[PDB]
Design a binder for this molecule. Structure first.
Ligand SMILES: Nc1ncnc2c1ncn2[C@@H]1O[C@H](COP(=O)(O)OP(=O)(O)OP(=O)(O)O)[C@@H](O)[C@H]1O
Length: 336
């Protein structure tokens, strides 16, 4: 019929819109959404979100009202999803991977394989980096029966953008059940620094803090052509017996190498402080694929607003329901 969604839900960001676009394409159910990002510094559709709407529109021949920069309202009636070889340009440092994450789930069901390439930003602090998608999310997707491979082709830092990320995706043959319990013990930890036009010694300082706090099996420093923008990110990948997670921070002006790694160091100990398998962000990114599989579960410490939003949107579009039960500070998120 028509699903009316309130864009003020949760933290009131673009996440509710991207999740709705995915589920709408998949199920054929139209939706309307009002108050899109209405309370944010730059409200309504930004170029990342408009590019997401454009891509969804193009892949499924949708009928759409309000696809314009700044629009706080959208109505979307999906048509038939077509596989193919698609290319989209954000035109800003907006997140490539968030555009990808909007349309890839629709392509899981399409006729044959597809490829999607997006240009834009690649190292936004509040989006999944390509390496997170590739090394943390995609291995779990494969366990659920979903096969996609993401590759970062070029880095694009804020504000210039001009990075490129592409994903090859195939339709699901069959779903499997993935049940994540505890993190298990550490198998190893790997620290990584990216530099583009930033003094080499910064990376050195950053790696130091991580060590002496953790035992690192790897310590990696990646240098890019400064022309690829002034940019600096610090990552820590945590491989445990049951799962691999990965966390990152983006260095900025007025912040010291020691404290950026300090922020990252803090986040990692928050993750390690609990027995939960999945970190804060990965949790929200597993909701849709598990819902589409019709089964699955994971543990997370302190379910985020985005996790709860994604669950709510999934339950509006699909006949699945999630149970959330906390045991000793860890929440088990499961399909009933
Ligand atoms: N450090 C991180 N690692 C992995 N994924 C992340 C990280 N930060 C954010 N994400 C993912 O990016 C997505 C969007 O998160 P965010 O909270 O910025 O949404 P939002 O504020 O609604 O987005 P927008 O900026 O489009 O309004 C979520 O799926 C989240 O899990």
């Amino acid at each position: 019929r028509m699903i009316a969604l309130d864009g003020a839900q949760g933290e009131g960001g673009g996440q509710i819109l991207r999740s709705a676009l995915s589920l709408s394409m998949i199920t054929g159910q139209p939706f309307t959404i009002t108050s899109i990002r209405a309370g944010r510094a730059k409200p309504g559709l930004l170029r990342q979100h408009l590019t997401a709407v454009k891509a969804a529109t193009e892949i499924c021949g949708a009928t759409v009202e309000g696809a314009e920069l700044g629009s706080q309202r959208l109505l979307f009636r999906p048509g038939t999803v077509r596989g193919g070889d698609y290319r989209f340009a954000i035109g800003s440092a907006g997140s490539c991977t968030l555009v990808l994450q909007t349309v890839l789930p629709a392509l899981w069901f399409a006729d044959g394989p597809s490829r999607v390439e997006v240009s834009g930003g690649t190292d936004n602090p509040s989006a999944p980096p390509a390496d997170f998608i590739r090394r943390v999310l995609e291995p779990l997707l494969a366990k659920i029966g979903i096969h996609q491979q993401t590759t970062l082709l070029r880095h694009g830092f804020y504000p210039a953008g001009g990075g490129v990320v592409a994903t090859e995706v195939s339709p699901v043959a069959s779903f499997n059940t993935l049940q994540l319990g505890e993190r298990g013990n550490i198998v190893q930890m790997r620290g990584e620094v990216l530099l583009a036009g930033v003094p080499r010694h910064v990376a050195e300082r950053e790696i130091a803090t991580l060590a002496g706090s953790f035992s690192l099996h790897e310590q990696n420093i990646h240098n890019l052509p400064r022309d690829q923008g002034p940019g600096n990110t610090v990552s820590l990948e945590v491989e445990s017996e049951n799962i691999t997670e990965r966390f990152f921070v983006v260095g900025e002006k007025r912040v010291s190498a020691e404290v950026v790694a300090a922020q990252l160091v803090k986040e990692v100990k928050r993750y390690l402080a609990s027995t939960a398998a999945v970190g804060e962000y990965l949790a929200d990114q597993l909701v849709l694929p598990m819902a589409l599989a019709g089964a699955g579960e994971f543990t997370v410490a302190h379910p985020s607003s985005n996790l709860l939003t994604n669950i709510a949107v999934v339950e509006r579009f699909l006949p699945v329901r999630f149970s959330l039960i906390e045991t000793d500070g860890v929440t088990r998120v499961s399909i009933e």
